[model samples]
Target chain A: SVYDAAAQLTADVKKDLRDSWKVIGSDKKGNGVALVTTLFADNQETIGYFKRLGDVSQGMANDKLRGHSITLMYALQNFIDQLDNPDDLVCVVEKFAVNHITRKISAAEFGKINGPIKKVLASKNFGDKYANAWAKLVAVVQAAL
Target chain B: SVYDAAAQLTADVKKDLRDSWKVIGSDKKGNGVALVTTLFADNQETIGYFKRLGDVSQGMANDKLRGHSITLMYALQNFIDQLDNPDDLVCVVEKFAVNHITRKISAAEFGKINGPIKKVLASKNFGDKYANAWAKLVAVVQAAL
Candidate 1:
């Protein structure tokens, strides 16, 4: 059925992406710092959603990088690894989303980062195969959030 | 000066013994079965103390192995590791001894087993220096037990 296509898509590109995801810093080896920079860059105003990165003056920007960013990268890794295991994924993602409650991150702001992330993943050889996989994955993540 | 020797003994040999400990599981490095069997064999009455192996008729003995023997080995390892930090080691040993209480293992029974454990450690080449270090560590553990 066309209904399970996302699940099918997840399985199809899962191994390729899992191979791509070996290091968990946004899946690609060098992708973490670049994707995060691109994420904060494209969505410059969206930096307000991150507790640590919210009020970066000139000096503390790099210091702001650790907590919120690592959680997102690990959350995405969790999303992929728990593809077939939705409830565990939901538990972690839901728990992580609760982490954002007072910090002001919302679904709309999360949606804004996807394009920039996919663009970065494309350059790292993920191509369309895993990109659509990510779209579906993130789509379901909202239910978790 | 004997007090100073006690202090230096823990310091000089403590790190070496902790580096030796690195893992909780007698499960790792093939020690679980061999060391555990040696433990029970050298102290035959101690086997009666384990819940699973107690009063056995060849039914559910391995299930008992998981509880007591592993705790003692790992607790001793923790005691040495926390030589500089006695509270942390005592916390683990204290938690372990609590388990022994309901299982009918006394402080005296705890005392009976250490000699056998050190004998095996020496054969695996723990040597005199750290072996004696283990002795002092256990002496304090008796206070907690």
Candidate 2:
């Protein structure tokens, strides 16, 4: 049963990600804008770290807002692509945990991003196996936090 | 001011896009994959169209490949920056029409990308502007396609 962890994260991830990502790709706003709006809207104070909105309001129409969202989307895709390789994802988690230490992110701040990501990913058709694997991934991320 | 339209595209574009898109602030393997890889790969049928990739197989490791992606990242940011003005996007469209007439991009091919963009929805303060700009960008690009 020692191989269970590997199988869950790797084999099942293939099943979970299938067709799920296509919806995000199809959205006209593009993936860059999609998630960033949700995260920044919910995590207000974090906006301060990103100083240069030039002069637009912070909501949906904001260009600056979308750009930041896309970056994380890109970053997240890298994680998703490697979901089968939990160790690689763990490598990212390790950097993320300490990366925050380098930047002074708090547990509460981490809460804002992690919860929203789950909520967003939950809307898809992927099942509990995906959820369990996702949960562990987040656990590692959270544990780092 | 006779060339006001052309002048704005050059000088004003320079002014509007000032120093903003330094980082990906980014996209897909998901839009990330769309441009960076497409331009650099050599299936031979496409090589004639992308005269600038300089060489072949600009894969994940290709510096030239990454540069092209970054260019789009910058272009989309510029588009986001110019989003507030509907005409600006149109002018971009008009220019794009001229540009691709020269390049020979088909409407179906143009269909893959909405406009001459790379890094769209890039950040700081662009939403309503980015949204409007992105819309026309799609409109023109789709029209031509």
Candidate 3:
């Protein structure tokens, strides 16, 4: 029997993810809004496509933007909840990736969030260990996309 | 410390896959044509979308249709070759599936190939064992899409 080696998320990584979320998820709506906003500012191309959803500059105050930001946080929560179960995690990510396809967002565009994500972690004064763990999970999403 | 349980392809299934392909790969072009043709006829909606690629009714003799059929067989052969490498196999399938997204193919439409695939296997005189193995792999693709 062969299980996906690359898809494996070590216990250490899972713990780091849970702990990181504990901090960020406490104010998920706030952190999520910042993350999505920073993402658009970081990547000009992505904002162009995302403009159809709403004005990125409006931030979470806007109805649709608030929903989008909260929804983004909730998606991360779902991934964390499925951390111990690799099967569900992969399936969830795959389903998430298709939404990008529907929106015509390329994997490259999706990946721009990497910098914003790490920046958030860095702001929390978390060490490089947490950043590495977060990067591993992001790679899984990138591969899925 | 977890790998994807549902995504694991057991050795027995891999053996069955290789064995089945041994028979079909020999006349891959012919079998490929038959499979694609049967797929379109079995699912009318698919052929309508695929008609843009060329004429499915024209069969393999038509240049584009022949290329399409052979490419499909080659894709299967790629899957078989990567059977032992679960990470690669999943990655390959994910990439293969995004192409469907690009063409606006829904997971339900993609799944319609299940009947045609098993029918081809049955026509070759394979038993339920092979059908079950093939179904497992197809499930992976369906989920990825």
Number of the top lDDT candidate: 3
Model 2 sits at a Cα RMSD from the real structure of 14.2
Of models 1 and 3, which has the larger DockQ? Answer: 1
lDDT of 2 by residue, B24-126 (tens): 3334223443454543332345566766555546454543444344334544544555455544444344544545766777767654443323334333344
Q: If scored against the real structure, what TM-score would every candidate get?
A: 0.44, 0.40, 0.49
Clash list (residue pairs), candidate 1: none
The interface root-mean-square deviation of each model, in the order shown, is 13.7, 9.9, 17.0
Can you tell me which runs of candidate 1 are displaced by over 4 Å? A1-10, A23-30, A54-61, B1-145
Worst 10 residues of 2 chain B by lDDT: B1-10
- What's the lDDT for candidate 2? 0.48
The deviation in Å at residue A101 for candidate 1 is 3.7
TM-score of chain A of each: 0.71, 0.62, 0.90
